[PDB]
Amino acid sequence: KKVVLGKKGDTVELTCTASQKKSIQFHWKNSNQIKILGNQGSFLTKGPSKLNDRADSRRSLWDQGNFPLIIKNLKIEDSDTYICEVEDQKEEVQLLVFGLTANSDTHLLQGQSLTLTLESPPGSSPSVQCRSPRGKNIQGGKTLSVSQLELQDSGTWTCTVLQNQKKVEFKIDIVVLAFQK
Amino acid sequence: DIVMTQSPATLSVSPGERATLSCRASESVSSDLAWYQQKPGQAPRLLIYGASTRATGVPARFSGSGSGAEFTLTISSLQSEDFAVYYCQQYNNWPPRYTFGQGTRLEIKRTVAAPSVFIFPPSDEQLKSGTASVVCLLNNFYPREAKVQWKVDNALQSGNSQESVTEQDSKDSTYSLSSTLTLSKADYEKHKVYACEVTHQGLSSPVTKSFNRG
Amino acid sequence: LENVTENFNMWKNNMVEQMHEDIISLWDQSLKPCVKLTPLCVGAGSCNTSVITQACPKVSFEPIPIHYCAPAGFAILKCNDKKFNGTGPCTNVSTVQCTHGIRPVVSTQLLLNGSLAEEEIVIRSENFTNNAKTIIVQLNESVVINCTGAGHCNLSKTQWENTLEQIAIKLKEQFGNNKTIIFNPSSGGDPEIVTHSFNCGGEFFYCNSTQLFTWNDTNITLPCRIKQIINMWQEVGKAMYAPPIRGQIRCSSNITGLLLTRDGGTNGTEIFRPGGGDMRDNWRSELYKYKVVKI
Amino acid sequence: EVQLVESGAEVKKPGSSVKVSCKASGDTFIRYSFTWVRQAPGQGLEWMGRIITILDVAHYAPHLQGRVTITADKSTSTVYLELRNLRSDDTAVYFCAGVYEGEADEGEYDNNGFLKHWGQGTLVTVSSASTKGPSVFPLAPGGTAALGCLVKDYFPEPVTVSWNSGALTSGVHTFPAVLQSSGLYSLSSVVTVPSSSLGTQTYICNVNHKPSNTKVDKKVEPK
Ligand SMILES: *[C@@H]1O[C@H](CO)[C@@H](O[C@@H]2O[C@H](CO)[C@@H](O[C@@H]3O[C@H](CO[C@H]4O[C@H](CO[C@H]5O[C@H](CO)[C@@H](O)[C@H](O)[C@@H]5O)[C@@H](O)[C@H](O[C@H]5O[C@H](CO)[C@@H](O)[C@H](O)[C@@H]5O)[C@@H]4O)[C@@H](O)[C@H](O[C@H]4O[C@H](CO)[C@@H](O)[C@H](O)[C@@H]4O[C@H]4O[C@H](CO)[C@@H](O)[C@H](O)[C@@H]4O[C@H]4O[C@H](CO)[C@@H](O)[C@H](O)[C@@H]4O)[C@@H]3O)[C@H](O)[C@H]2NC(C)=O)[C@H](O)[C@H]1NC(C)=O
Ligand SMILES: *[C@@H]1O[C@H](CO)[C@@H](O[C@@H]2O[C@H](CO)[C@@H](O[C@@H]3O[C@H](CO)[C@@H](O)[C@H](O)[C@@H]3O)[C@H](O)[C@H]2NC(C)=O)[C@H](O)[C@H]1NC(C)=O
Ligand SMILES: *[C@@H]1O[C@H](CO)[C@@H](O[C@@H]2O[C@H](CO)[C@@H](O[C@@H]3O[C@H](CO)[C@@H](O)[C@H](O)[C@@H]3O)[C@H](O)[C@H]2NC(C)=O)[C@H](O)[C@H]1NC(C)=O
Ligand SMILES: *[C@@H]1O[C@H](CO)[C@@H](O[C@@H]2O[C@H](CO)[C@@H](O[C@@H]3O[C@H](CO)[C@@H](O)[C@H](O)[C@@H]3O)[C@H](O)[C@H]2NC(C)=O)[C@H](O)[C@H]1NC(C)=O
Ligand SMILES: *[C@@H]1O[C@H](CO)[C@@H](O[C@@H]2O[C@H](CO)[C@@H](O)[C@H](O)[C@H]2NC(C)=O)[C@H](O)[C@H]1NC(C)=O
Ligand SMILES: *[C@@H]1O[C@H](CO)[C@@H](O[C@@H]2O[C@H](CO)[C@@H](O)[C@H](O)[C@H]2NC(C)=O)[C@H](O)[C@H]1NC(C)=O
Ligand SMILES: *[C@@H]1O[C@H](CO)[C@@H](O[C@@H]2O[C@H](CO)[C@@H](O)[C@H](O)[C@H]2NC(C)=O)[C@H](O)[C@H]1NC(C)=O
Ligand SMILES: *[C@@H]1O[C@H](CO)[C@@H](O[C@@H]2O[C@H](CO)[C@@H](O)[C@H](O)[C@H]2NC(C)=O)[C@H](O)[C@H]1NC(C)=O
Ligand SMILES: *[C@@H]1O[C@H](CO)[C@@H](O)[C@H](O)[C@H]1NC(C)=O
């Protein structure tokens, strides 16, 4: 079970490698056996997937025997199990798209609450651990909130999300201002 | 290594008449040829491309013709702005190696005019620096061809003088030539009489303008 | 000559690969691109693109029938069985010294100047339940198409409709009668496999295949354009050719079959789109009845 | 419409390298092919090389091969010309040009070798000489008398000469500059005025040279 964790809006690449280095026939499909993308001869072909416009590959690597599946503008519903069929061999890889969005704007005042919301695909139970520039560590399953904000908490927050032993790092800039006069 | 040679080098045609320029190649360039127009201090302007076709913005009086190693640029009626330096280009061969003609200068043709020859001795301010330059001025003459010879104490001078010619005038269509003779102060005071000889078509006899030093 | 039962496999064949290399070499020696762009990678992600510029003379390009023969020590077997699906055992088998005439036509979505199936339209797929496998169609009736300069191509509407209808019938024979056959254009990709591409008079023609491939159970003019920048079918990369020669460029070709792809899946409907782009299948079309054994 | 604006003039020492830029605007950048053509003063046109924008491929002249590189930036829509190992003979006016090849993104390329559009030009002077101001000397003065000014020992080009701050126009001939063996340019400016005007009307020549940032107004007297 090969699991790949991507980021929402970002670009992810699924690797596929043959036994020998050659340009040969390969087909990337989804778990529903709907055609994602592939190649005919030296030409690139696409299937009628919902990932059509946002999916592509690297042809320069086709001569190296590597036929990667590259998807940009990642979305939550893009999470699925993809299959790469090459030389009568099926290489299966699971894709999980995650995201982290603040319930409140980056501009905040000292003492106000900072609420974080994690967008995850159905069937997954990720563990989120966030760290402020202060160096403090807070953990939560989905929603993570900080009651009292400090002036020193203004900066780049680093939140790592762990799923299936894999972990993905996020960076969210939070601006903390103060009330005086 | 296709060489583009244009003929003639300089063509003098009276305004309102027809002009004919020729461009020859070392080998057949087929249907690929380009005629350009260029004015002093300005960038070349596209006139003809493919030799069978006239470019956008180009007056219909410009007509290209010919094939292979032979080409002809024909202008029906020469206007005031039609006089310029014309070029031909070979884009034919691949991988691309392109060459241009040596250019054909079009000149306004008028009646023969005699030059006004003046001579200017070096100023005292220039002699203060330790250098001396004598200026020979030929004003308002046609054609452009003229001969200027510096003679110091009856002895002919060569290599120490330089010449410059202005573009053809827009009114009387004449020319102006300036010949500067540069010599050191030590060699300048080593002589007495400095003379400038001018040979031109408008002159029945060579005109010599001279002066005495000191 | 001799008569024995022999297993034939069209989908794995050496003649296909060798003919592929022969035609690649043919296009290499005949048609010279003005600028060739090929990828070069050491496997470290970053790939430097090498560019080779050479002379690009315009030559007259026409396919000629090419018979293939086995040298001393080898012999070619031929399946004479009618409606042979391309795989499995064969009853009537004739050993031939040379294969029949095969024109090396390089094209996508359509097979030109090929050979018709005798008794009916026959479809062939390595795995029919596999949507990734290209389906080769062989017609029992040829459809003439006239393609002219400046891209357009006029062809018979009725003949094409009836053709698509019979093909749909055969697809109903293979995939079951309860299924409804619906034809749709390409799902997208490189412009070569999206439209119908081919070489006519040394020029590369791309014609819109939408009008042909849009059909349902309940004088067609195809717009065409000459592209001087193409993707090489020989190897991955791009190549730029010389401008199209002046004068009338016209080719009348016979369509002996198509290359189709099937969408994946449910419910009750099968969608078929124009395939191709792999010329190995184009050679496999005429080479399906041949194989090589050693004596 | 087409707009081509090149880089300002450049002055380099022999052995150094020069890089000039050409800004293209008004149309699609990848649909045009760009040729660089340099012209030596007093000489004709010379083809340096031509670059295909869409394929990012450049070809060069056989004699300039390997010491010159032509590149194209599609993002900024700018064509760059780089020349290395400069020599005194490389001094010339470099013209940036281009031509419309049709739609390159759609695969249509006319591969035209001629040039429809041109730039304003960029003067590149390669010499061991240093930038300095000119020394203006008076020329002392028949129905008409001639007088003028002598511009000598300046570098680099150009130099603008006027009379009476633009008040005197008719009869003024400014000769093209000549290159002295010392490596400094020199030119003469003349004017023909009535001989009866001498002693009354004052004539002052105005010589302006931008690179050395100097302006010299010299008065011409009959004596
Ligand atoms: C699939 O297969 C098919 C079938 O093979 C392929 O179709 C062929 O495609 C090729 C190109 O790849 C075409 O080649 C052109 O041929 C024409 C002439 O065609 C006419 O004559 C044909 C020959 O018949 C003869 O010989 C056989 C064998 O001996 C014999 O059996 C037969 O009786 C006859 O004697 C006819 O077959 C053809 O009829 C067919 O096509 C008609 C139109 O489609 C159709 O209506 C008919 O029903 C019939 O099907 C037809 O009558 C050549 O003229 C042409 O050559 C010109 O163009 C090439 C570039 O392509 C160029 O290099 C040449 O220089 C030449 O260009 C000159 O002539 C032009 C005429 O307009 C002119 O415009 C140019 O300016 C130039 O003229 C200049 O130079 C000349 C010479 O210096 C000078 O005299 C002039 O003054 C001037 O300066 C091509 O070679 C075939 O036509 C075509 N065949 C068929 C069956 O249609 C198809 O390509 C394959 N598909 C694929 C994917 O490749
Ligand atoms: C096209 O025709 C060929 C030849 O008939 C078909 O190949 C045959 O495929 C069948 C299965 O569909 C094979 O049958 C198998 O027999 C073995 C015993 O040897 C048995 O254990 C299996 O359960 C199975 O029934 C058969 O071997 C095979 N013929 C050979 C010898 O290659 C082919 O299936 C046809 N194509 C399609 C798409 O139907
Ligand atoms: C299965 O294989 C057999 C064995 O080759 C095929 O029989 C052959 O069929 C061809 C064409 O029908 C015969 O050619 C004929 O030759 C005679 C002269 O004898 C000529 O007059 C005819 O015009 C034709 O060209 C050939 O004689 C015959 N060969 C043998 C040994 O029987 C048969 O065609 C194949 N089965 C099927 C379904 O076609
Ligand atoms: C012809 O194409 C069909 C359709 O793709 C192939 O059938 C597929 O065969 C594979 C095994 O090769 C089956 O995979 C199975 O998945 C189950 C879980 O559902 C797993 O437990 C098995 O270990 C196996 O991996 C797959 O179900 C099956 N596809 C369908 C839709 O039936 C067939 O293999 C191809 N024939 C040849 C000659 O390769
Ligand atoms: C090619 O196959 C088609 C489909 O079977 C044949 O079309 C039939 O032709 C017969 C006469 O030969 C007609 O009676 C049928 O009505 C046709 N079927 C349909 C539904 O179109 C065709 O005959 C075959 N080609 C040849 C030349 O035999
Ligand atoms: C190529 O296509 C054009 C456009 O369809 C054809 O023009 C038609 O020709 C038919 C006769 O075949 C006329 O009845 C129509 O009036 C024409 N249509 C138009 C709008 O002009 C043309 O015939 C085709 N060329 C060939 C040789 O088949
Ligand atoms: C090829 O032909 C098809 C069918 O005419 C074109 O698809 C149409 O594209 C237009 C926009 O150009 C859309 O408004 C229509 O909805 C499309 N029709 C269908 C049936 O989807 C296609 O644009 C053509 N391709 C090219 C490159 O010209
Ligand atoms: C279109 O296909 C038909 C059928 O294969 C071709 O007709 C043959 O033409 C050849 C000469 O080229 C004749 O010797 C054969 O007798 C014909 N076959 C039959 C059964 O009629 C035709 O040549 C093809 N058209 C083109 C332009 O190639
Ligand atoms: C194509 O055009 C040629 C020339 O007119 C004609 O002989 C042929 O019948 C046409 N083909 C079709 C199917 O219209």
* Cα dihedral B92, B98, B100, B101 sign: negative
Nearest to B26 by CA among B119, B137, B86, B101: B101
Are C68 and C243 in contact, with CB atoms under 8 Å apart?
Answer: no
Give which of C242, C236, C243 is closest to C50, Cα–Cα.
C236
CA distance A39 to A84: 12
Q: For chain B, what is the radius of gyration of the CA atoms? A: 23
Among C140, C142, C159, C164, say which to mutate for ligand 5: greatest number of ligand atoms within 8 Å of CB: C140
From C142, C250, C286, give the residue whose CB has the most ligand 8 atoms within 8 Å, as the site to mutate.
C142
Domains of chain A by residue range: 1-98, 99-173
- Residue B125: CB atoms within 10 A of its CB come to 12
How far does residue C207's CA lie from ligand 6's centre (Å)? 17
Task: Provide the CB-side half-sphere exposure for D68 (13 A, CA).
Answer: 23
Separation of CA C79 and ligand 3 centre (Å): 13
- Both structure tokens of C261: 């792809």
The domain that contains B105 carries what CATH number? Answer: 2.60.40.10
The DSSP letter of residue D166 is G
Q: What is the resolution of this structure in A?
A: 4.5
- Top residue of C187, C267, C273 to mutate, by most chain A CBs within 10 Å, is C187
Q: Closest CB to A42: pick one of C187, C232, C265.
A: C232
Last residue of a domain, one of B110, B137, B163: B110
Return d(Cα B83, Cα B81) in angstroms, integer: 6
**CA-angle at A67, arms to D57 and C195, nearest 5°:** 65
Kind of pairing, strands B45-49 and B53-54? antiparallel
**CA D59 to chain CA centroid, nearest Å:** 25
CB contact under 8 A, B126 and D137: yes
Short-list A41, A86, A89, CA closest to A68: A86
Q: Which domains does chain D have, with CATH numbers?
A: 1-128 (2.60.40.10), 129-222 (2.60.40.10)
DSSP C92: S
Element (H, E) at B185: helix B185-188
> Cα separation of B57 and B51, whole Å?
16
Two domains, one topology: A1-98 and A99-173: yes
- Residues 6 or more apart from D87 whose CB is under 8 A from it? D14, D126
Q: In this structure, what token pair is assigned to residue A97? A: 């798209």
Residue B33 CA to residue B89 CA, distance in Å, equals 6
Contact C276, C259 (CB under 8 A): yes
Are residues B118 and B103 located together in one domain of the fold? Answer: no
Among B91, B110, B129, where does a domain finish?
Answer: B110
Report the top-level CATH class of C1-295.
mainly beta
Helix (H) and strand (E) counts in chain D: 0, 19
Parallel, antiparallel or unpaired: strands B10-13 and B104-108? parallel
Q: Do residues A173 and A157 lie in contact, with contact meaning Cβ atoms separated by under 8 Å?
A: yes
DSSP chain A: -EEEEEETTS-EEE--B-SSSS---EEEE-TT--EEEEEETTEEEE-S-TTTTTEE--GGGGGGTB--EEE-S--GGG-EEEEEEETTEEEEEEEEEEEEEESS-SEEETT--EEEEEE--TT---EEEEE-TT--EEEESS-EEESS--GGG-EEEEEEEEETTEEEEEEEEEEEE----
Query: How far, in Å, is the centroid of ligand 4 from the Cα of A29?
Result: 14
Can you give the residue range of the structural domain that contains B192? Answer: 111-213
CA C251 to ligand 9 centroid distance, Å: 10
Q: How far apart are CA A24 and CA A60, in angstroms?
A: 13
Contacts with B103 (C-beta within 8 Å, 6 or more apart), sequence order: B6, B85, B86, B87, D44, D45
Phi then psi for residue C174, to 5 deg, are -75, -50
Same structural domain for residues B81 and B164? no
At residue A133, what is the residue type? Answer: P
Q: Which two tokens stand for residue C25?
A: 């070499």
In one-letter notation, the amino acid at residue C143 is V
List chain D residues with CB under 8 Å of B182: 180
Cβ pair D110, B49 in contact under 8 A: no
Give the architecture (CATH level 2) of A99-173. Answer: Sandwich (2.60)
B120 and B97 in a common domain: no
DSSP assignment, residue B30?
A: T
- Residue positions counted in chain A: 181
Q: How far apart, in Å, are the Cα atoms of D9 and each of B57, C25, D92, D123?
A: 29, 51, 11, 5
Sign of CA dihedral C66, C72, C73, C78: positive
Chain B residue whose CA is closest to C242: B94
Domain boundary among B75, B110, B145: B110
Other beta carbons within 10 angstroms of residue A43's beta carbon come to 22
Looking at the structure, tell me whether residues B169 and B147 fall in a common domain.
yes
- Dihedral of the CA atoms A77, A81, A85, A89 (nearest 10)? 170
Class of domain A1-98: mainly beta
Q: Give residues preceding each break in chain D, C–N over 2.5 A.
A: 141
Name the residue type at position D155.
Answer: F
Q: Where are the beta strands (DSSP E) in chain C?
A: 6-9, 35-41, 47-53, 74-79, 87-90, 93-96, 110-112, 122-124, 135-138, 143-148, 152-155, 180-183, 196-200, 203-207, 220-226, 229-231, 238-240, 251-262, 269-274, 290-294
- SS3 label, residue B123: coil
Report how far residue B210's alpha carbon sits from residue B206's, in angstroms, rounded to the nearest whole number: 13
Are the C-beta atoms of A174 and A153 separated by less than 8 Å?
yes
Chain C residues touching A63 at Cβ < 8 A? 39, 41, 235-236
Beta-carbon separation of D109 and C228 below 8 A: yes
How many alpha carbons lie under 13 Å from residue B43 in its C-beta half-sphere?
21
C13: left (phi over 0), alpha (psi -120 to 50) or beta: beta
Domain segments of chain C as ranges: 1-295
Contact C264/A23, CB-based, under 8 Å? no
- Count each helix (H run) and each strand (E run) in chain B, helices first: 2, 19
Specify the long-range contacts of residues A131-140, CB closer than 8 Å, at least 24 apart.
Answer: A131/A157, A131/A158, A131/A159, A131/A160, A132/A157, A133/A157, A140/A116
- My answer on whether B47 and B136 are in the same domain is no
Residue B150 and residue B196 in contact, taking contact as beta carbons nearer than 8 Å: yes
Angle between helices C14-30 and C279-287 (to 10 degrees): 120
DSSP C26-53: HHHHH---SEEEEEEE-SSS-EEEEEEE
The Cα C123–Cα C181 span in angstroms is 15
Are B140 and B166 in a shared domain? yes
Contact C229 D57 (CB under 8 A): no
Ramachandran bin of B103, using left for φ above 0, alpha for ψ from -120 to 50, beta for the remaining angles: left
- Alpha-carbon C208 to chain mean position: 17
The CA C88 to ligand 2 mean position distance, Å, reads 7
Q: Which two tokens stand for residue C133?
A: 């496998």
- The set of residues, in sequence order, having a beta carbon less than 8 Å from that of B88 and lying 6+ positions away, is B4, B6, B23, B33, B34, B35, B36, B71, B73, B100, B101
Query: Cα(C166)–Cα(C258) distance, rounded to whole angstroms?
Result: 13
Distance from CA of C133 to the nearest CA of B (A): 42
Residues A79, A121 contacting (CB under 8 angstroms):
yes
Name the residue at shortest CA distance from atom 9 of ligand 2: C88
Q: Distance between CA C256 and CA C144 in Å, rounded?
A: 9
Cα–Cα distance measured from residue C163 to residue C220, given in angstroms and rounded to the nearest whole number: 14
C-alpha distances in angstroms, C252 versus A66, B16, B127, C143, C146? Answer: 41, 56, 89, 10, 5
Of the partner residues D57, D104, D109, the one whose CB lies closest to the CB of residue C53: D57
What would you measure as the largest C-alpha separation in chain A, in angstroms?
A: 73
Per the CB < 8 A criterion, the answer to whether C208 and C194 are in contact is no
- Indicate the SS3 state at residue B41: coil
Question: Are residues B68 and B120 located together in one domain of the fold?
Answer: no
Q: Which residue among C161, C252, C253, C255 has the greatest number of ligand 9 atoms within 8 angstroms of its CB, and so is best to mutate?
A: C252
First CA to last CA distance, chain B: 59
Phi-psi category of residue D87: left, alpha or beta, with phi > 0 → left and psi -120 to 50 → alpha? beta
- Nearest beta carbon to residue A40 from set C49, C237, C276: C276
If one counts every other C-beta atom within 10 angstroms of the C-beta of residue A46, the result is 23
Based on C-alpha coordinates, what's the Rg of chain A?
21
Under 8 Å between Cβ of C182 and C190: no
Residue C265, Cβ neighbours under 10 Å: how many? 13
How many folded domains does chain B comprise? 2
What determination technique applies here? X-ray
Alpha-carbon gap, residue D72 to D51, rounded angstroms: 8
* Same domain for B148 and B98: no
Tokens of B191: 């002589």
- Determine the Cα–Cα distance for residues C120 and C138; give it in Å rounded to an integer: 8
Pairing of strands D10-12, D122-126: parallel
B57 shares a domain with B34: yes
Q: Are residues B144 and B164 in the same domain?
A: yes
- Judge whether D85 and D67 are in contact, CB under 8 Å: yes
> What is the DSSP track for D26-80?
SS-STTEEEEEEEE-TTS-EEEEEEEETTTTEEEE-TTTTTTEEEEEETTTTEEE
